[PDB]
Symmetry: C4
Subunit: 433 residues, 4 copies
């Protein structure tokens, strides 16, 4: 008799792939937490007078402040095993910035020939940048204090070190305790030479299996990903067979007929792309879990795109029924005029973006970059953050009243014009009908 459709295999995919994603997601979350919490601690350990939330406004304004910040950072590094809870370890760095047997590297980076002399208006500068590094060795368990800074020639000051730690959060997830090495860089940046030196701390973790994990009680994830590979490979073969058979029938139709370029359903192309991205992502995740490679951005993006493109196959299966099909056809027929209107709205929107960036960039905090301007305008179209924009512009009414008037006209015209255009677009879409 009539055999049933093997499309149930895809119903497996929507389940199986999704489960994989969830599992991966959970694990990934834990890791990022362990990376973020540590970073917070490092700030509180190494940044003098640091408080939560003061990340972008944290800076030094006097020479004494800079000296105390640097000395506090180095002293807290030297006194880490006594004052810090968390069981960090020194690395005795043998890389490029550190010599063979040094833990911390305080490097002051400044111009070679710099004679800045206001009150006469003369100056000669050689943009070539020299770097002077003082190496400090971890406590056993000295000369960093005698450090001049040359504030007139200063470009930046950087502190580099590393700390090895053991991730004990795995036991909650029944994993074998993971194993980290954090590279910490503290930068006092004087690029602007404006009298304000921002201070920041950044970290980079290098996850690696450590030597002897003698954990008690110490085969499901590894089998799950190969199951994903098998199912996705099966779909690839089946969809490729459909693509070939359809193309053969189209090839005969070419001579027969001798919209014609569209004889293949894009659903199979979507499924093929989903399988390709799921297989690439799952191989990358196999490598990530094995610790042989560390790139969690590409793998997550691939898996998420695969999951989304797989959840559009449910719409594919919904099309079958007439009731859903009518609405889907209405969507499909509405699309082209929407794109056509979007072209003209886009050129007006680009013009407004350029004007807003060039005029309100100096004064408005929300117009600093072109991407920020586009985001602000897009959110303003949908009715978000309108009053905060108006109030941010009102805060500078005392200075450059002409700029304030132009901003008022610009914002009012943009909002009114774009709401009007959407409504007109549709009364056309209710007439054509």
């Amino acid at each position: 008799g009539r055999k049933p459709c093997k499309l149930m295999l895809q119903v497996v995919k929507i389940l199986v792939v999704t489960v994989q994603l969830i599992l991966f997601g959970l694990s990934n979350q834990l890791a990022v937490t362990f990376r973020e919490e540590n970073t917070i601690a490092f700030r509180h350990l190494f940044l003098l007078g640091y408080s939560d939330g003061a990340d972008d406004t944290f800076a030094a304004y006097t020479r004494e402040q800079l000296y105390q910040a640097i000395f506090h950072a180095v002293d807290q590094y030297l006194a880490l095993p006594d004052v810090s809870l968390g069981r960090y370890a020194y690395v005795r760095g043998g890389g490029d910035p550190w010599t063979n047997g040094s833990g911390l590297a305080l490097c002051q980076r400044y111009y070679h020939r710099g004679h800045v002399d206001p009150a006469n208006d003369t100056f000669d500068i050689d943009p070539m940048v020299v770097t002077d590094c003082i190496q400090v060795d971890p406590p056993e368990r000295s000369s960093y204090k005698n450090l001049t800074l040359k504030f007139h020639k200063l470009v930046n000051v950087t502190i580099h070190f590393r700390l090895k730690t053991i991730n004990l959060q795995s036991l909650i997830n029944n994993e074998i305790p993971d194993c980290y090495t954090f590279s910490v860089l503290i930068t006092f940046d004087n690029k602007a030479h404006s009298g304000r030196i921002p201070i920041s701390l950044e970290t980079q973790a290098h996850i690696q299996e450590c030597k002897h994990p003698s954990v008690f009680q110490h085969s499901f994830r590894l089998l799950f990903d190969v199951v994903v590979i098998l199912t996705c490979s099966l779909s690839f073969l089946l969809c490729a067979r459909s693509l070939l058979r359809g193309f053969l029938l189209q090839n005969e139709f070419v001579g027969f007929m001798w919209e014609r370029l569209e004889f293949v359903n894009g659903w199979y192309i979507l499924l093929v792309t989903s399988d390709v991205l799921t297989i690439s992502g799952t191989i990358m995740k196999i490598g990530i879990e094995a610790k042989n490679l560390a790139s969690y951005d590409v793998c997550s993006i691939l898996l998420g795109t695969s999951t989304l493109l797989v959840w559009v196959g449910v719409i594919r299966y919904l099309t079958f029924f007439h009731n859903y099909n009518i609405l889907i056809a209405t969507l499909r027929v509405a699309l082209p005029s929407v794109m056509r209107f979007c072209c003209c709205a886009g050129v007006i929107y680009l013009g407004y973006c350029f004007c807003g960036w060039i005029v309100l960039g100096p004064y408005h905090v929300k117009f600093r970059s072109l991407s920020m301007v586009s985001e602000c305008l897009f959110s303003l179209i949908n009715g978000d953050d309108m009053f905060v924009t108006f109030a941010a512009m009102q805060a500078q009414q005392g200075r450059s009243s002409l700029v304030w008037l132009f901003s008022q006209l610009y914002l009012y015209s943009f909002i009114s014009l774009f709401i009007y255009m959407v409504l007109s677009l549709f009364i056309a879409l209710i007439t054509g009908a």
Copy 2:
């Protein structure tokens, strides 16, 4: 002659039930205030260097900080009757965590065999968790200071105690002063082993009538709830009679005819459910006021659902008139296509939710959990918090620019696609008409 409709009884319900809710609500509000204010005080009494608003970011970062926090908490417990205003009382706890004659319990909870040793990469851990408790007795009106912590093996530190107090706010509401016992637990949590130990304080109140309330001037609430019971029981009987009579007429129609499954109006089912929930909620509230049981979540939920389902009966009574009936029929006929569109929009929305959680979870504060992702997307559809999302993603443009580009594409595509789909859904709903 034609007797008038007894439906006025339901008009009583909408009044009477509502009044009950309001009364209950008012009383409940007072109690929660007395519970929240006390908690705030406890924080300010027991958390060292605590300030309002620093609840999620409150943590300790050095061993000395942890020691001072613990010792300050215990000392403030010991000096409570002298420094604290509010007239709290010790309990001399005789429960499980406290021995017979001890008030406070400082319990340090740590692994049994733990040898964490970075700089060699080896480690052996036994996940079995030992607990060492030091009992402190309330002041009459000692050895807690000699406490090591074992920071390498630490899991958490907990402080348990109780405080009895008298609720004097009742006099405002002309009640007999209520009577509380607060169980306070202060946890320093080192589960992450990340060098940052969050500190928090939680409370649990046990309301109970106390022994001899010799209040001056010391029968309406008790009579009101039984009135609710009578009225709701009456409605149950009347609606059940209607259900039976309709079903008998339907039973004859079955043979006669031998939409057919729908011969009963859902209004009576709604009213029956309302009566059932109001009776259950009012019995539970009787018990709550009598102090025999303490569960204010189920009772409030039941009463609120009953009130809402009772206020839909006003729509029932509005249907009668033709003018309202036409609009109600329009709503009813519009519903099915809305559900049908909601299915496809839902599968696209689930796909987008999974993709956003898996990709932007590590970096974006609004994508930490699947429920949070769904809430963010739902609020983004309606035009809320769009620019804060864009700015939170812009804050991490320097690192992983590929992630930033993907986030831009993802957000723009989601917003544009979903606004487009609503409009297309309706131009279908203006054609079908």
Copy 3:
């Protein structure tokens, strides 16, 4: 020939009345500023450890804190002429709270018989409240320190005083320097008996002309308001004449015909109400400027309502032209179905409001009162503060997960149901057409 319409008189009104409002508004703004700035200063002068923005969370938590706050307030009152800039004056209060020759009144207010005794669960309280007041005299240019508080019986502590000052901001507005007396009340409120005593400062100003204003260079406002009176009185007479003539014609039509109840245009009723409110408001403003009465709430409300109802007469004059008339008629014919739908939407909205208040009141900050619940739901319908609501509910997912699930269902159902109902209402309004 055909005389032109005297309706130009109303065109005068829209101008003249508006101008009056603007003038009044400007003056009023100055006064409120002088009242608010002073208040801020008083806080910074009299509240110990007070900082801007800490108004609702400012409280005392220990007996020593309360004692220091009270003593600091009294000492700062005693040392005002030496430490405070602003030239305030003592009043030597001769009112009720102050005796003849006392400036400040520190009044502790506590029960008469109060024996609160936890750890035995007994208590006797006499709700009668005694008050003990200590009077302090202004410095010439003593025994307040010996003050017990009786924290177990305490209800509140209040500090009352007054300060006379001269408003010098008038010179900017070319007025004669106005002249204030601020009554300051500082309350430490212990009504909750929860261990947290909120501290707040409130003021009340009594503007009065002072004795001898020998200002240099020292007739337009007074003439302007009588011009408003004349014009508004003229409109009243003219509109009343129209009302009478129309009613006479209607009276004959009654017998002739023997919508019939509507033979008078509501525009004249609107204008009559506008004139009545403008005359009342301008008389009240005459009195306010003369300083004979001090109530700036009624007068401002009357003037604003008059201005709005006068700016609707411009729509009246727009109706004349056919193009505007067609749109206005469309609005008028659309109104009744909107009201009819609003009834049913309102009963569903009231039901949801009651349910949300009763369930999420204890846990959610936005559901504390019924008015707050209604405001939150109304703003949620229009797409505002959705994600902050969801996040505030997410913050309490750990405790009472059933409440969190109910909140999720409640919010999602409310938003989806109400957006659906608006769209259905209109597809009816596009069919009927």
Copy 4:
């Protein structure tokens, strides 16, 4: 044969002009950063106890606070070369406020005859304002301490000085290091005489080429702007030719025919305006880069308006195709009824604005000025900041409950009325069709 259209020249414009804008924008951004960062530093250098974000609430409340603030500012000016990083230079000011050989000017500004005397209610004031200035000379590398203030007569206190610096950020942009002079004014403002003296710091930069820039490695921008001039001049000539030829044909049509007033396409007028504004802006930018004039507001506004009006020419070129033309014609035919409705909505909106400003101005932070009221109402129409408005009004429910009730009615009526009017406007726009 048929020559191709020279309209490709305009396709050049859209490119070339845009590029210019971007280049200008980038440069401008750098300058404003160098101006803002320095200002921040100056605050942190000269304002005693200043912290980021405390700009509007920063004020002094006691005489000692004012004295310490003034003395700290002057001392930090005197100790700038030793404590400040950034290499600023003294100017030895020879302007009006400074004498020949003085760097800083501390000027106290107060009335001539002022006898403010509360507790008797008398006062005589002479509005003539005397000014007493103390000149301080920069450190070599004294009597400012003996300064009385006359707080009863005080109007304000001002500190004026200048600082020369070298902009070293150019090297990043491969420019020749720019060269600044900042005029700093610190004002302690006592205009209100309310006991609260706001303290603020403002700066004004004067960019000028300095004397001898002996930079190493030291013709594209200058050539680019003249290219813009050539292209825009070409368009002016071509569009003027089209305008003349069209007008000649219209002139003959006048006699022939003897909408008739519209025989010229507004696209050429738009292009002519774009060319005029681009040429003016590019000449102004030439002058700005040459440092001969310093006005970055007019030039940026001109360039942005030119860019926007040039990006509307892409819509001009889109009109050609029929598919886009149909939608554009729908927009054009929809416009007039939108304007006609906007008139009536505007008069209702003006009425509501006046009422809201006059009533809620004293109490609501969002209704301080008419422009602020209009912005708040416009954002409220689109569904933004609704709940913050409601909560700000709820915060003052205890005082003037009548005002709170009026605010509730006003806000609800405004929102409901205006949403209703948009929908009615369109059901008219779906009928007319």
